[PDB]
Amino acid sequence: TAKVNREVQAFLQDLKGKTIDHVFFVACGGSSAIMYPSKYVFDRESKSINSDLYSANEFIQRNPVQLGEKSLVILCSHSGNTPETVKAAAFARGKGALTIAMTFKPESPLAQEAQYVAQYDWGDEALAINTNYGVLYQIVFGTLQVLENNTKFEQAIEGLDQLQAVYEKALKQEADNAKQFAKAHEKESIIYTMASGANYGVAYSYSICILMEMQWIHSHAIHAGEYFHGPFEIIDESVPFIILLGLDETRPLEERALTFSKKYGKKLTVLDAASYDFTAIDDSVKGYLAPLVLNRVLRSYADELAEERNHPLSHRRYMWKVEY
Amino acid sequence: ATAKVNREVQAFLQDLKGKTIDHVFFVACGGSSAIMYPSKYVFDRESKSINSDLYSANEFIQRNPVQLGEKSLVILCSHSGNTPETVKAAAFARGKGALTIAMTFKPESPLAQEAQYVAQYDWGDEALAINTNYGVLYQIVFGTLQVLENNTKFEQAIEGLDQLQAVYEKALKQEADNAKQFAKAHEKESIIYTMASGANYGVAYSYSICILMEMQWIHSHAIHAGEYFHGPFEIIDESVPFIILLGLDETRPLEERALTFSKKYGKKLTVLDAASYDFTAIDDSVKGYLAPLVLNRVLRSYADELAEERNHPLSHRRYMWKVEY
């Protein structure tokens, strides 16, 4: 509790005794992607709360009939300006839902619309527990503890605190691999990603944000289960695949996908969480935290790629530049 | 209405009456999972009391939702009825006390053996919309909502499905030249994106993973029309092919916004707009739920032309049914 963001603590204190039967994870792009692990956590842990995840404008237009006074809507926007997420917060609040927004900017429009606001840390100095993923888990595990007496909160928070060391060790261990990846993918026009379970949003974000948005590299995040029902026909020794293996219950799906890809593919970039040091993380939560480490490592891969391709990650031709 | 419902589906609905169900799980793999996306949209817009979730079959088993149990309904689909993950998912759900209904083209299959209820569907050139996999799925879905929640759209859904075959015919005729043009224009394109939102997203997903990747070895990715403006749109330029679907559901504005942008910065666009088809015999209450079926049928004609132009039969595979995996 002492490690929990003070705004999240206030939210959790107010949440006690409330009747909530549905949680909606609502954001756009990268901010939506960071919520996939939380939907996995709810699916594995929540006995009485329905969980759904939608892109912000999808949420508004789909207008779930179950959205109302017994709903909790968790929103996220880095800048706090993403118009669809701002509108989603107002829409949910107008329906009587309890709303909490996460942002890097506290005076933003999203902050102004949401009932509760939690800021996260960002940049080279940010510690895992205080990052967007860290704060989202404080809210998620906290909610489950307050509303269902879920017993994993302490281990989730202690795990997050210990996760910064895991990040730093993982990053050092993968430095040469990140450089090799950049060298090997300098001129590849398409790079697929693949993962399952709690790790699927990490692959999705890498595909839509790092590769498409920030590198203009074609991508597609293939779900490791779905792979064997169509997509796998695309692989050959020239098709690059980034394959993620986590520590959650779905790891067998990723293992199966990897085994096949090693046989018929060749240009494989494998990030396996089992190769990192989770000895200080409780077994009850290491599957839920592995995506955070995988995501952090991927960032170092992105940095090397950007440098090697002379395409800065901040470069855009449309976002913030034209009307849309 | 009820007279047009598959007899097996009618028996299931009869038995469903009075049961307490608080959660529906849509479980299948690949193309069979994609056909369930519209049903998830229907549940989101119509069900006041039933939680709906959708997963690929092996994800369902491994994720092992804690809310899966005696008050769950699990709807599964497998064409051959042999898909091992779907077969195991049926057994898994049934073992947890869930009510299970499997759709398949083969009633003597392992999936049919595991599922408590079995509903077959028709397939091929002679199959009418109402009797196809999408048709039977909606009989189950709207039927379930009518039986458990007194949902009022059942009659209009069933009548709409019956009238939808005529929509397919007119739409196919109207799109025949476009299908040929698409094939000629995409003969040598290595990557082709698809894009849609709401109840139409599974149609795009299936086209990407099944028609393009699986059956043509063409790279693809189904972009959600809302998500597009938060990263993926940076990829478009005049040389990137995009297939864009515009439906008739509440999310059409997302599709319209995406198209508008794509027309300004892209060029190789293949646009299928459900508003250009004839839904005059379909009730307004269900047009948005039925449009994806029509979009899907038209896309199949595009696939047929493409396969011919590329001399790559849709039945061709290098791994599926040929190697161990």
From Swiss-Prot, chain A:
Keywords: Carbohydrate metabolism, Hydrolase, Repeat. Residues 11-149, 177-307 form the SIS domain. Gene3D superfamilies: 1.10.10.2240, 3.40.50.12570, Glucose-6-phosphate isomerase like protein, domain 1 (3.40.50.10490). GO terms for molecular function: carbohydrate derivative binding; glutamine-fructose-6-phosphate transaminase (isomerizing) activity; hydrolase activity. InterPro entries: FrlB_SIS, Fructosamine_deglycase_FrlB, GlmS/FrlB_SIS, SIS_dom, SIS_dom_sf. Its EC number is 3.5.-.-. One of its GO terms (biological process) is UDP-N-acetylglucosamine metabolic process. PROSITE patterns: SIS. Disulfide bonds: none annotated. It is an enzyme of class 3 (hydrolase). It holds the Pfam family SIS. Catalyzes the conversion of a range of fructosamine 6-phosphates to glucose 6-phosphate and a free amino acid. Homooctamer. This is Fructosamine deglycase FrlB. The lineage of its organism: Bacteria, Bacillati, Bacillota, Bacilli, Bacillales.
